[PDB]
Design goal:
The structure is cut from a larger assembly and holds 1 copy of chain A (about 725 residues) and 2 copies of chain B.
Chain A lengths: L1 H24 L28 H22 L4 H14 L3 H18 L3 H17 L5 H18 L6 H4 L2 H17 L1 H4 L3 H17 L8 H21 L4 H22 L5 H4 L1 H20 L5 H21 L12 H17 L4 H22 L5 H18 L3 H5 L3 H13 L3 H13 L6 H13 L3 H18 L7 H7 L4 H18 L18 H14 L7 H14 L4 H4 L5 H8 L6 H20 L2 H17 L4 H13 L4 H18 L3 H27 L2 H11 L1
Helix pairs in contact in A: 1-2, 2-4, 3-4, 3-5, 4-6, 5-8, 6-10, 8-10, 8-11, 10-12, 11-12, 11-14, 12-15, 14-15, 15-16, 15-17, 16-17, 17-21, 18-20, 18-21, 21-23, 22-23, 23-25, 25-26, 26-29, 27-30, 29-31, 30-31, 31-32, 31-33, 32-33, 32-34
Chain B lengths: L3 H6 L12 H6 L9 H18 L10 H7 L7 H15 L2 H10 L2 H24 L1 H8 L7 H14 L4 H20 L4 H15 L6 H15 L17 H9 L8 H20 L3 H23 L7 H22 L3 H26 L5 H10 L2
Helix pairs in contact in B: 3-5, 5-7, 5-8, 5-9, 6-7, 7-8, 7-10, 9-10, 9-11, 10-12, 11-12, 12-14, 13-15, 14-16, 15-16, 15-17, 16-17, 16-18, 17-18
The chains are: A mainly alpha (about 725), B mainly alpha (about 375).
The complex binds zinc ion.
Zinc ion binds next to loops of chain B.
PDB class: cell cycle
Keywords: ATR-ATRIP inhibitor, cell cycle
Entry title: ATR-ATRIP bound with VE-822
């Protein structure tokens, strides 16, 4: 009955959408249009919707599509989405700014709900590409009305994740990479006011670059063609836009991909730039940015040109770290050309107006982060790092000027005079990022200044500088005098209003055992190139921190720490207990044994947990604790596993079905970990398990202290 | 002015590995009674004529929306497609009798080459039928009542029904995809034509049969369900319920080294079919409650482990499958009260599943009352 | 053109031989089993581009200027050209070596596809425009054409025709500066005219010779040598027909192409200059005989074309009467045979209503 009602609604919505499409043909007009469906005896024991202006239709259709979506869960059947997708393809054919957006969302939703049939996707795909092309002609008020929904629909249709290339028809992927490179040759991308649209184009471009199976979308040569069109568009748009960040990514990805192809070309030493002609054009763009910076002087807007130069240099440094070359080697942008750019940057800092350089300092701070990535790929020997560390502290230098550290630092003299003008423009968060890189600055260069600067950022009350210092402070202390003991100033500094500083200190503890080890070469990314766009933190940190630590057995020290850690493991926060669940298994790995002191700690924790559970009477805490006790038992191959299993049997032997179910899930988990038949793992622990069950039966006898219900209970236990 | 079909048909060979794809069909040489060699060449020439013919015609796939709705897709009648079909007819007809002979013995190489080529032809046929409704309707019309290529394809389906070797299993999954495209293309009156496929289907969904075949088979059964006469034709009324085997495959999955994704989509397809069935004594009714409990448990477990939005499409999938399964289950409770008794067998796990499911439900924005109320029925 | 996609996917353009355009895209069997599979995939990509047929819209309105009414410039066409290179050029190597027949069939099919692409696309010509050794497929084609005339094989006969036709059709649309490239064909073309070369190749030859007279660099080439001039080989083939088949409706075509060439050389403004006039006389007679015996006008369009060649021959001999004013000295030797034909055709030309007053004054001379 419900379905017949919904079907009448569907037929009415279809009549209205068809009226719209007939308006498009212009052959006839039904206005005022009253749908045949939903005529009822109640009206006259009717009044079907009446519309008289095309916009009235549009609104009726919006309402009807909303209704369809709301019922979508119950309405969707196998191939029900076919008709709905035809209706949606029509709705896209002519699209009112907002109904267009909602219909985008709707077809995307259906796509998710039942996958995408190959044939229907062609219908909608045609109109879709047409819309994309019209974007530039469209006024922002109209295109943007549905763009965001466009972006989400694209995400769903072109998800970075696996098989999203299967969803789309290969021809469609080629057409879209072809449609994208066309907008790029057009410059339409830069034209459209909304950044996220060109950003979605770049999204698709990357999706093609890295994820998609090579050639599935299109022929490899023509795909490289589209990539080159994209590069052409980007080179110009970057110089145009004040900020190239919303385009930096796609570029970086293309650069890495080109390097990948180049490496294979080389082997069955060429710069990663000279090898790729398209990357050579990118290098031309970067050189043009630098030249404009230097040549313009005051003319060029320091902010914009500096942002472009910083984007270029950041790409170069990113490739430096990520791209690896004595048969084969990869040249990189010269650090002396970097010094030229840096002379230009100093002249600009001087030229920018005090308020003007705040933007320039931001862009300069980004360029400095890129330079730091370069230093991480290859730590500059002494002087570049020196000058850098100096510049990063310039916002603090003019204030520091009268300090003992300024008296000692070698470059501090010139830095004092140079810092006043550039610092008042230096953004506080900008100088914070600078100290993040200043902390990164190695010890060899500006040693005195670097130590005193970590100490200062810890001393400074402001949170940004202190967090920057905290980041590299563990490494600093390691290098300063002792890898083993943290410094007291930082210890006091460890406590932070921001939870994130505490989680950083968790990672810092996890890193401190390595700190005892020879300090490993540090790279900001350190792996995992950043995409273009806290007790649980404590468990994460500990899992990594214990392995390096000699805690397998250690001592009272362990005992006490683990005591605190057990308190935490049973923490009021449900999510705290969870995701530490299994952190206890990682700890069993971290423990050298599951018996003795470790077993005693586990038993104490179980007693505390029984008390809390009686007090808690809360299902969520119980779920967390059950999963945790389980993971514990599963990880162990000895006595703890049967002890945890007996505690779990006690939990299972409770009136509540939920307790028994949780314990049973943990039992299945342990059996799996054991990797033996039900009867076999029974056999291993049969004596103790049945003995605990018999103790429970003696408790049940004390409870009895009628035979009918007693026997029913005993049989149910069996 | 789409020509999507033409691009699909003539392109890089659709078949991974073996390059036999319509293109070659058209260029296929004679070396590599009723099925005369010259008739083979002529089927190739016919598909080529259709290649050169489709583009010529101009057409509007659907005259009105209702009509295009019934088929669920608009097709522009390209005479070329009908010409295409004779080529598929010849290549599909080939090697069928040869397979029959291979089996009767207790000659294979020809059967093998022809079978690979025939799966190529099956995909091609999917495309060609998909684009032009006339080529379809031609096969579809019958005295009471099948196309000749349709009867040879029934033979092929018998091979699907039969115990499937590795290669034959992949071929069978291909056939099932063909069949779902067949159904969707078929008209309502042609669903009675589809009735014949039902007898083949029960063997098609078997523990031995591979997973993708089963996903496509659930889809085909769903397509069949819309027809009023077909809908009862599902369970055998205490004779083994046919649906019964599908849900059993999902409950315990033979072919365990298989993509988890396709598992999940098959299960979601059965969910969709159950909903569509709802709109339109058995051992199976008790049996169905078991697979769904297991599936909801899998999803709930996945959710408990997962934290934050579902980056993986798989996780978002569960979130959605969990809500849909909760909805189907709420009915697996309103529908039958005896339902709960046969459900008790899996109820131990199901009860644990329920609560965290309620949590995630209340959490999701896409979640609704109609979706959470469903869940409240199961857990209480 | 959308038809270009039709042509692409079409039963073997060449009559017979079992040729599949689908094999021009996907055929197992330069060699080494690598990058030729890739060429086939590239043909598939061109087919993909071809299908959509987005380019061939509204009669190629975008292109303008020279090559006006250009066959819709097609990106897909350029892509098909590479696989054709794996085909045509391979036999060219076999040709370089002192079996071949199997290669020749594929080569002929590839040449036919190349002809279609060149005719109907604005891209493969853009490849000709690229320039040398550029358009290397042209270098391969030129090698084949020169060798085709040299060696008389059953495969050689057709390949010559096809290469010539490709060259000619391309040179048609190209600019004058772009015809300075085709200049290289002029040297190789001399062998083609001789009877030993295929008659169908000799007809395409006459066509390309008319085209040459259209080109400024090709003209001088047509009468550059002190001996022969590199022209009059054509004058000699119409007069003496080296074909056993000797179908009447071929020699008329040759002479008519040549007569259009002569009228074109006139409009555009040796002992070889002398042969064209006597050959025109001979043709005026030949075209005259076919119509005279039946009487009245043409019951055949080709017969109407023979009549057109007749009228053009009288007018062209008049221009030739004004040309080398001392027409009579070189005419006398063939003068009897020419005088037999001229005045009766004068009567016939007066009979037709269409004959022009300018053609009429020409007629008046003789
Ligand atoms: Zn049943």
């Amino acid at each position: 009955i419900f379905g017949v009602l919904t079907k009448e609604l569907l037929q009415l919505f279809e009549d209205l959408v068809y009226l719209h499409r007939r308006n498009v043909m212009g052959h006839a007009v039904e206005w005022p249009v009253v749908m045949s469906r939903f005529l009822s005896q109640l009206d006259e024991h009717s009044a079907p919707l009446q519309l008289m202006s095309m916009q009235n239709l549009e609104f009726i259709e919006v309402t009807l599509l909303m209704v369809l979506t709301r019922i979508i869960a119950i309405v969707f059947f196998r191939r029900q989405e076919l008709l709905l997708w035809q209706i949606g393809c029509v709705l896209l054919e002519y699209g009112s700014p907002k109904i267009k957006s909602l219909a985008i969302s709707f077809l995307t939703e259906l796509f998710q709900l039942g996958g995408l049939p190959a044939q229907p996707a062609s219908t909608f795909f045609s109109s879709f590409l047409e819309l994309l092309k019209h974007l530039v002609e469209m006024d922002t008020d109209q295109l943007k009305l549905y763009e965001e929904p466009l972006s989400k629909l694209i995400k769903t249709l072109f998800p970075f994740e696996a098989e999203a290339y299967r969803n789309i028809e290969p021809v469609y992927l080629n057409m879209l990479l072809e449609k994208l490179c066309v907008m790029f040759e057009d410059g339409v991308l830069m034209r459209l006011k909304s950044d996220l649209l060109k950003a979605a184009l770049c999204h698709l471009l990357q999706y093609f670059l890295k994820f998609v199976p090579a050639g599935y979308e299109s022929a490899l040569q023509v795909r490289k063609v589209y990539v080159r069109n994209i590069c052409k568009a980007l080179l110009d748009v970057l110089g145009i836009e004040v900020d190239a960040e919303y385009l930096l990514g796609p570029l970086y990805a293309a650069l890495k991909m080109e390097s990948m192809e180049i490496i294979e070309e080389i082997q069955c030493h060429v710069d990663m730039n000279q090898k790729s002609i398209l990357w050579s054009a990118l290098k031309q763009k970067a050189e043009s940015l630098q030249i404009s910076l230097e040549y313009s002087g005051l003319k060029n807007p320091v902010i914009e040109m500096l942002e472009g130069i910083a984007v270029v240099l950041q790409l170069t440094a990113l490739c430096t770290v990520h791209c690896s070359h004595p048969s084969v080697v990869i040249t990189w942008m010269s650090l002396d050309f970097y010094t030229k750019v840096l002379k230009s940057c100093r002249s600009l800092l001087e030229s920018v107006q005090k308020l003007d350089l705040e933007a320039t300092i931001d862009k300069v701070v980004k360029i400095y982060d890129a330079l730091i990535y370069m230093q991480v790929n290859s730590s500059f020997e002494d002087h570049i790092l020196e000058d850098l560390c100096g510049m990063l502290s310039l916002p603090w230098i003019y204030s520091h000027s009268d300090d003992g550290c300024l008296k000692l630092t070698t470059f501090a003299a010139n830095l004092l005079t140079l810092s006043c003008r550039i610092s008042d423009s230096y953004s506080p968060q900008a100088q914070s990022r600078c100290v993040f890189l200043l902390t990164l600055f190695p010890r060899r260069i500006f040693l005195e200044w670097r130590t005193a600067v970590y100490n200062w950022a810890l001393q400074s009350s402001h949170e940004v500088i202190r967090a920057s210092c905290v980041s590299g402070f563990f490494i600093l202390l390691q290098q300063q005098n002792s890898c083993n003991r943290v410094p007291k100033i930082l210890i006091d500094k460890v406590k932070d209003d921001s939870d994130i500083v505490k989680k950083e200190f968790a990672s810092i503890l996890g890193q401190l055992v390595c700190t005892l080890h020879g300090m490993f070469y540090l790279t900001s990314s350190l792996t995992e190139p950043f995409s273009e766009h806290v007790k649980l933190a404590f468990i994460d940190n500990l899992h990594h921190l214990c392995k390096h630590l000699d805690f397998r057995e250690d001592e009272t020290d362990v005992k006490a720490v683990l005591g605190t850690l057990l308190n935490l493991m049973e923490d009021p926060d449900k999510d705290v207990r969870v995701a530490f669940s299994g952190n206890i298994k990682h700890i069993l790995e971290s423990l050298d044994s599951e018996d003795g002191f470790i077993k005693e700690l586990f038993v104490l924790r179980m007693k505390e947990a029984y008390t809390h559970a009686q007090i808690s009477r809360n299902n969520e805490l119980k779920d967390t604790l059950i999963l945790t006790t389980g993971d514990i038992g599963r990880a162990a191959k000895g006595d703890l596993v049967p002890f945890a299993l007996l505690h779990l049997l006690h939990c299972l032997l409770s009136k509540s079905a939920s307790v028994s179910g949780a314990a049973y899930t943990e039992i299945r988990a342990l059996v799996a970990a054991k990797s033996v038949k039900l009867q076999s793992f029974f056999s291993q622990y049969k004596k103790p398990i049945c003995q605990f069950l018999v103790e429970s039966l003696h408790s049940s006898q004390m409870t009895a202290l009628d035979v009918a219900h007693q026997r029913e209970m005993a049989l149910n236990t069996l | 002015q789409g020509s999507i079909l033409i691009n699909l048909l003539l392109k890089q060979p659709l078949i991974p590995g073996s390059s036999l794809s319509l293109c070659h069909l058209l260029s296929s040489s004679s070396e590599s009674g009723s099925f005369s060699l010259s008739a083979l060449r002529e089927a190739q020439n016919l598909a080529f004529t259709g290649l050169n013919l489709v583009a010529r015609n101009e057409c509007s796939r659907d005259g009105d929306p209702a009509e295009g709705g019934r088929r669920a897709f608009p097709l522009c009648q390209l005479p070329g497609a009908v010409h295409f079909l004779p080529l598929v007819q010849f290549f599909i007809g080939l090697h069928c009798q040869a397979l029959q002979d291979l089996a009767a013995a207790k000659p294979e190489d020809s059967v093998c080459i022809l079978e690979g080529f025939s799966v190529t032809a099956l995909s091609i046929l999917q495309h060609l039928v998909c684009h032009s409704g006339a080529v379809v309707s031609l096969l579809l019309s019958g005295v009471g009542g099948q196309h000749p290529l349709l009867k040879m394809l029934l033979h092929l389906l018998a091979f699907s029904s039969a115990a499937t070797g590795h290669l034959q299993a992949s071929v069978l999954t291909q056939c099932l995809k063909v069949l779902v495209k067949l159904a969707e293309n078929t008209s309502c009156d042609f669903l009675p034509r589809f009735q014949c496929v039902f007898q083949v289907l029960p063997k098609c969904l078997s523990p031995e049969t591979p997973l993708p075949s089963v996903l496509l088979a659930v889809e085909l059964l769903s397509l069949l369900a819309d027809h009023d006469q077909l809908a009862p034709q599902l369970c055998s009324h205490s004779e083994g319920c046919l649906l019964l085997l599908l849900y059993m495959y999902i409950t315990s999955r033979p072919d365990r080294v298989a993509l988890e994704t396709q598992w999940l989509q098959l299960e979601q397809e059965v969910v969709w079919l159950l909903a569509k069935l709802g709109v339109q004594n058995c051992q199976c009714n008790v049996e169905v409650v078991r697979a769904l409990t297991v599936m909801l448990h899998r999803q709930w477990l996945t959710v408990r482990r997962a934290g934050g939005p579902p980056r993986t499409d798989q996780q978002r999938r569960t979130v959605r499958c969990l809500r849909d399964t909760v909805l189907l289950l709420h009915g697996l409770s309103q529908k039958d009260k005896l339902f709960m008794m046969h459900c008790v067998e899996v109820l131990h796990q199901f009860d644990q599943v329920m609560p965290g499911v309620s949590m995630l439900i209340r959490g999701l924005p896409d979640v609704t009352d109609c979706e959470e109320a469903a869940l409240d029925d199961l857990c209480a």
